Amino acid sequence: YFQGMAYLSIDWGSGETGRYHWIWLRDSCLCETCRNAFAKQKYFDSATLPLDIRPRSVTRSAENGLEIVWEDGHESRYPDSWLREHSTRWSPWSSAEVVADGTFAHADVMADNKALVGALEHLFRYGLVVLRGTDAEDVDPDALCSRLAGFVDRSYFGEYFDLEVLPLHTDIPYYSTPPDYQFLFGLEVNDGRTRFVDGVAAALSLKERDPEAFAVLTSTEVIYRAEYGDAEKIYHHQTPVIHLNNDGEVVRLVNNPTKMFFDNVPFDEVTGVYRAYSAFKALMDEEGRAYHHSWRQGDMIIFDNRRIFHGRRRKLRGGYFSEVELRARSRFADET
Amino acid sequence: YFQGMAYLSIDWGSGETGRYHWIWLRDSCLCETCRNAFAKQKYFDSATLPLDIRPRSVTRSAENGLEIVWEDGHESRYPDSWLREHSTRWSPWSSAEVVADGTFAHADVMADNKALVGALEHLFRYGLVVLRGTDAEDVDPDALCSRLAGFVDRSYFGEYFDLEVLPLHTDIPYYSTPPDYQFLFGLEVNDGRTRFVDGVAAALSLKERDPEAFAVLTSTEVIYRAEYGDAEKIYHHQTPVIHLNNDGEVVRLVNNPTKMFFDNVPFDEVTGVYRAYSAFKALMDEEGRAYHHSWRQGDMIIFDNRRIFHGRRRKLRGGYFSEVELRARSRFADET
Ligand SMILES: [Fe+3]
Ligand SMILES: [Fe+3]
Ligand SMILES: [Zn+2]
Ligand SMILES: [Zn+2]
Numbered sequence: 001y002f003q004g005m006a007y008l009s010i011d012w013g014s015g016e017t018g019r020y021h022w023i024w025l026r027d028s029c030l031c032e033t034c035r036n037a038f039a040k041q042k043y044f045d046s047a048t049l050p051l052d053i054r055p056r057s058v059t060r061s062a063e064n065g066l067e068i069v070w071e072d073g074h075e076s077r078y079p080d081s082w083l084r085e086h087s088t089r090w091s092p093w094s095s096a097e098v099v100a101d102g103t104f105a106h107a108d109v110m111a112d113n114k115a116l117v118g119a120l121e122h123l124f125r126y127g128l129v130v131l132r133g134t135d136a137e138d139v140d141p142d143a144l145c146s147r148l149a150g151f152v153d154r155s156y157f158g159e160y161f162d163l164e165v166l167p168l169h170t171d172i173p174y175y176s177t178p179p180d181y182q183f184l185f186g187l188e189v190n191d192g193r194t195r196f197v198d199g200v201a202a203a204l205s206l207k208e209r210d211p212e213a214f215a216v217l218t219s220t221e222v223i224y225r226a227e228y229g230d231a232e233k234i235y236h237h238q239t240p241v242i243h244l245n246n247d248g249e250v251v252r253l254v255n256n257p258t259k260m261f262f263d264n265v266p267f268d269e270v271t272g273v274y275r276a277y278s279a280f281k282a283l284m285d286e287e288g289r290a291y292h293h294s295w296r297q298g299d300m301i302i303f304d305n306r307r308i309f310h311g312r313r314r315k316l317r318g319g320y321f322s323e324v325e326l327r328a329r330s331r332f333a334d335e336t
Numbered sequence: 337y338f339q340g341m342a343y344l345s346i347d348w349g350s351g352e353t354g355r356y357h358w359i360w361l362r363d364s365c366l367c368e369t370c371r372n373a374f375a376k377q378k379y380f381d382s383a384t385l386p387l388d389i390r391p392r393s394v395t396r397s398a399e400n401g402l403e404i405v406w407e408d409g410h411e412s413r414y415p416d417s418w419l420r421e422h423s424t425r426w427s428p429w430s431s432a433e434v435v436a437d438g439t440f441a442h443a444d445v446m447a448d449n450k451a452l453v454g455a456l457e458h459l460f461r462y463g464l465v466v467l468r469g470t471d472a473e474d475v476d477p478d479a480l481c482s483r484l485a486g487f488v489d490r491s492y493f494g495e496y497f498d499l500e501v502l503p504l505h506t507d508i509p510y511y512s513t514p515p516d517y518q519f520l521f522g523l524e525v526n527d528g529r530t531r532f533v534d535g536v537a538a539a540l541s542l543k544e545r546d547p548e549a550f551a552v553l554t555s556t557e558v559i560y561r562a563e564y565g566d567a568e569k570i571y572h573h574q575t576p577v578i579h580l581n582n583d584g585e586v587v588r589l590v591n592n593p594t595k596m597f598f599d600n601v602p603f604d605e606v607t608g609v610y611r612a613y614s615a616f617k618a619l620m621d622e623e624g625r626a627y628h629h630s631w632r633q634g635d636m637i638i639f640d641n642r643r644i645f646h647g648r649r650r651k652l653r654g655g656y657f658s659e660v661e662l663r664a665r666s667r668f669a670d671e672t
Contacts, residue, residue, distance in 0.1 A: 019603050021603070021607060023606065024599075027598065028599075040561075042593060042594045042595070044503075045503035045617060046593055046598070046613060046614075047593065047613055047617035047618065049610070049614070051610060086599060150492075150567055151490060153490075154487060154489075156486075167380075167381035167384075175660050176659065176660055177659075225376075226377075227376055229668075232668045232669070233664035233667075234664055234667040234668045234671060235660070235667075257378060257383065258379070259378070260382060262363065262382070263360075263422060267357070270357045270359065270360055271357060274359050274360075274363075274382065274385070274387060277383055278383040281383035282383065324512055324513060328570055329568060329569060331572055332568045332569050332570045
């Protein structure tokens with residue numbers, strides 16, 4: 001360090017050059033008065049750092065890396081193996097071809113982090129995965145949820161719900177923010193199939209066949225409502241069936257007909273949305289675009305409740321996963 | 337009904353006129369083959385209804401209301417007391433004056449629905465409420481959570497966390513979607529105060545004093561990161577401190593300095609965001625805009641984790657509430 005050196009600039013050889021501001025070097029101090037090495041958490045608010053902070057001394061040894069003494073006397077050490085590290089979504093499917101690639105073996109994702117990461121990444125991108133067990137296996141659903149997400153999304157229902165045994169729907173449309181992902185587990189299966197359609201593909205299909213119904217569905221709000229006196233909850237959400245972002249990408253689909261009400265659509269647009277809605281539903285019922293699942297015991301299908309329509313003495317067990325948690329499990333498994 | 341009558345139009349007297357399309361009247365049928373009166377849920381998908389459906393007969397008795405026989409022979413009855421019903425957010429606070437109006441008595445909201453509704457509505461609008469008990473009272477936290485939301489938001493921590501006993505922060509910034517609301521409960525209090533600042537007011541304040549720092553903070557992304565090896569979760573979110581919607585309304589604030597990293601800000605913008613961030617934090621530390629709370633036992637403060645910065649042998653118990661659930665409880669309590 002000479003007085004007035006504007007920032008740190010290191011030549012790593014072969015034209016790789018790192019540049020580091022003093023303010024950020026100060027903010028990044030590794031010492032035990034600045035950050036907890038265990039919790040990797042900071043003890044100060046960056047906001048207090050003196051903006052014009054300069055160092056008094058900058059010394060680099062090949063022995064103990066980069067050592068800085070700041071103007072205020074503080075001392076920081078930076079390993080070169082640290083400075084060099086800093087010198088630097090949805091895919092539609094109009095038909096069930098990509099679901100072969102998205103069937104994984106229970107044992108693999110239970111055992112191997114690369115398989116968990118791989119199955120979760122297929123789920124994030126395509127919105128459905130199938131996790132299949134063997135006969136030698138006796139697949140534990142609580143353990144599989146724990147492997148996937150740590151814990152499930154408690155809802156009005158509880159932690160899980162059972163179906164014992166048909167319009168296509170997404171689930172809980174009356175939540176202003178519905179659960180990200182749903183799972184169905186083959187709790188008890190014998191020796192009529194559940195369908196799965198990508199609403200994103202279907203909505204982009206509809207954009208072409210019928211741009212009118214697309215504009216209507218992406219811009220007219222209907223109502224989803226569920227009264228549940230037992231729990232003292234009325235869930236009431238007014239929202240469009242198809243949601244676009246600021247660039248007109250489909251980013252959510254919301255439809256369960258059984259709680260669907262058109263009561264608040266203006267008189268002159270009512271006929272238009274019944275037509276648009278009926279077009280959309282029919283398009284999805286087309287042979288070709290569903291994936292049909294033959295329920296085997298211990299099967300789990302996890303699917304993106306924001307975009308996959310699904311529909312039906314086997315007994316299934318269902319629940320929901322939060323994107324926050326799946327991604328954090330996937331990120332942990334991938335970086336170890 | 338005469339053949340070709342385009343829709344239903346009823347004169348309720350005094351110039352009140354209802355208009356009802358046939359398609360929606362069909363969709364709305366009250367009969368037991370169309371909807372479950374108990375679950376108020378529908379048995380069909382609206383999408384199947386024949387769009388050009390007309391009635392064959394429309395008869396209104398003052399005795400049993402409106403009776404329709406549809407072309408396909410279906411029969412529907414509509415009470416006039418049903419047809420007539422269908423013939424038809426955030427507030428900033430730059431200082432703690434509005435928190436007097438937002439202190440409610442535990443007993444009132446526990447007992448009276450109008451008080452629960454009133455306290456929850458103050459929470460939605462202003463982002464903080466205080467629920468205060470008496471000495472005769474022994475306030476139960478689980479019962480108070482149940483009264484407010486039915487259930488709390490399970491998180492990485494669990495259902496609740498304890499603090500036993502300082503930069504201003506919002507909590508869990510490393511969640512891509514952080515919890516909507518947080519609560520702090522006075523579990524064990526004796527006979528140094530927690531501050532509360534509205535980030536929305538502070539951010540609009542900053543827009544005026546320093547539009548540069550506003551633009552920087554609303555457009556430059558920083559990183560919030562929390563590694564938790566015990567739970568096999570790495571939470572990593574890149575996001576701006578101040579979030580605007582398409583009309584430039586502040587709709588979320590995200591900052592806990594202890595997990596905050598600027599590592600991925602471009603070299604040329606680093607100095608700008610340290611300045612902008614430091615301005616923002618300082619503005620909020622100004623005398624006047626905090627609300628300071630004197631912790632009494634059995635107190636609960638519920639506050640909007642999307643916008644209220646807060647900061648510190650008393651022992652507090654904390655957890656999180658979902659907007660979905662609070663609103664559903666408030667809507668249920670208000671409509672009974
Ligand atoms: Fe379902
Ligand atoms: Fe906190
Ligand atoms: Zn240090
Ligand atoms: Zn009917």
